[PDB]
């Protein structure tokens, strides 16, 4: 499972590009995550976005594992 910690790390990596649209996969190999701001949260200021309530998540598999 893509850990919450790993998802939080990714959200901080893309803290500038995080948006209402699905992001790229967080990993090149293995089970990563795609995140977006929930539609109902799009108007919250950046510093008030909550991990549990405001971020939608979805598993993504990549296989650049050579």
């Amino acid at each position: 499972e893509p850990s919450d910690k790993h998802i939080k790390e990714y959200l901080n990596k893309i803290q500038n590009s995080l948006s209402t649209e699905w992001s790229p996969c967080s990993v090149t190999c293995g089970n990563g995550i795609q995140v977006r701001i929930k539609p109902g949260s799009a108007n919250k200021p950046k510093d008030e976005l909550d991990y549990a309530n405001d971020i939608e998540k979805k598993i993504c598999k990549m296989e650049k594992c050579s």
Epitope: K5, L11, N12, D47, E48, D50, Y51
Partner: antibody
Framework: VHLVESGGGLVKPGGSLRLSCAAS????????MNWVRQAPGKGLEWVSS????????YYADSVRGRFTISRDNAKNSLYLQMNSLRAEDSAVYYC??????????????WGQGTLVTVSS | SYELTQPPSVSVSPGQTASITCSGD??????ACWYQQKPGQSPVLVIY???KRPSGIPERFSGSNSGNTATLTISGTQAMDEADYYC?????????FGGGTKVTVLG
Amino acid sequence: VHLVESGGGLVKPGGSLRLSCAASGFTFSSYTMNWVRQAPGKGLEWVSSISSSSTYIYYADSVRGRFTISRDNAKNSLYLQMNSLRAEDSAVYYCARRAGGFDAYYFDYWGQGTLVTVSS
Amino acid sequence: SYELTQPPSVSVSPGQTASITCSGDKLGDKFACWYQQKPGQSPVLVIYQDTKRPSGIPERFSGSNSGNTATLTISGTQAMDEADYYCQAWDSSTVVFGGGTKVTVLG
């Protein structure tokens, strides 16, 4: 980026005092801000945090119900209203800016601090 | 976290590696941060989000967070690194600081 605290001084046991923190060099209105304190010769103790919009406010258990954090995004200033003060509350009070997102938070800038002395 | 435990004091000679641990229930799930405080001065961030170094911090400072222990390591500890060091994590919106660790440089 500058954080300048003010308002420290003598207060009698059971008394009140208001601290201020004037911020410069960044978009104050977009950051969560915090008060942290440090008794003489002892460790750091978080006091309170206030979100940009003042919607999300939290307090340490040690001060809950006696202290009130607030901000005037207008004057790029943060405030801490302290009431029913005790000697245990004597400390340097620091203004600190929160950075990071999604539980990966840290304080990247601190003020020089203002000293509060609670004494008869 | 909700109770972070660092050793009161750490002593080393110049040039050797100083290690400060910071212990907390489930701390591996959190993001540890480290602050240096010299006497009479405000804290300075040296490590954030477990392992990242602010732009102006020397490379000899490093951080790790595994299991339930975060560690600050100063390689080639210099006399200028003498200071109090505080670990810090978030829990339930409550910001928790460790008790602080004074590093003494011997000799």
